[PDB]
């Protein structure tokens, strides 16, 4: 069964993926604007 | 003769590096 701790862990995985994607998008957009 | 192993350890640690360094110095000084 999906224990609450496992649900929280999957949520943390999603949040980390979101943070990394945000950083990547920021660098990409800024580089494209400047070049 | 107390802690014979300790005495042997001290003697080896004082002799082996000293002999190695002295042999190296004599070998190189010939150049």
């Amino acid at each position: 069964a999906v224990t609450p701790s496992l649900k929280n862990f999957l949520g943390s995985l999603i949040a980390g993926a979101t943070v990394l994607g945000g950083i990547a998008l920021a660098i990409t957009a800024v580089s494209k604007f400047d070049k | 003769e107390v802690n014979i192993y300790g005495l042997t350890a001290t003697a080896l640690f004082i002799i082996i590096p000293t002999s190695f360094l002295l042999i190296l110095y004599v070998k190189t000084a010939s150049t």
């Binding site: 609450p4 701790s5 929280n8 862990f9 949520g11 943390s12 950083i23 660098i27 990409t28 800024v30 580089s31 494209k32 400047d34 070049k35 | -």
Partner: protein, 351 residues
Amino acid sequence: TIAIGTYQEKRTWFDDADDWLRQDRFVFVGWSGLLLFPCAYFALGGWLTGTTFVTSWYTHGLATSYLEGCNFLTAAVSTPANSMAHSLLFVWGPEAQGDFTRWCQLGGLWAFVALHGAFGLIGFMLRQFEIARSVNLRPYNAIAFSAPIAVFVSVFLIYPLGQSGWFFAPSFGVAAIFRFILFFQGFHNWTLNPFHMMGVAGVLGAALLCAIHGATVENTLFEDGDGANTFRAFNPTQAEETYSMVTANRFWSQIFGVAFSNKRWLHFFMLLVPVTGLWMSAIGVVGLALNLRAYDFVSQEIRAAEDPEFETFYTKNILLNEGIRAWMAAQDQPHERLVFPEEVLPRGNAL
């Protein structure tokens, strides 16, 4: 055959990202910046927030915050309680369950700061490597920093990992660090361990070298300026050195007995001393983490126990350690629920 050189292909997103990151601005971001800046920023922010608002009432039974009326020397970010043995104390973890107030109360802020700070140190080392590669210099600053990172890793992660839990790691503060130092002096006899002796020698020798080199260089300058002050008689584009090596060499060969005759060797010795000292100290604390302490000198203990009329400073140090332990464990370790009656507390009156 189809040979190839370097960068003879079409440009890619990676090329644009690299070009933007490695620009010339007031702040050098670089690739290591992505890992360094966020982590260090959050570490500093967490420390300040913990020292300003959060308290340690429910972990150590103390009051450590400006909101509670503590000075800059007594405020600190206390470690989590001993019940939380080695949990990483995530906000979403089984302990906090997602409540920020309870997360702060239990003491996960310490783990937050410690982890993000360790990753910040890694990022800083990578930044030094990146700068050195960019400007084409050998990376010796990398090793010079590899020393303190090793010391930090040892003290703040390996020592608690061998003990009961995070409760015994340093708390980020001044009075907390003093408590830590006294705690080792009492329980481990950390002052008698050879590794701390070597570290002390290394640090003191580093200070000595700094002072002596500065004094010698500043007291052997060449006459290349009419003004009374020698600071303005120099520009960064000088060709020759600003001080006479021969005169300093003769002076220190006639005063002390042995003197340097090679700039590279001198500055490399400067680099070498402190790094070795701190590495040896780190190894010593690594050993202590497993309660592998140099405490006994069993022969002296046996001789002292045999007859009371034989006292050396070592026995007095042992007695002082006993006193420290007995009198401080009462409130230093609340989870043990220790209540020593005044009859049993060690005292010099009873020897």
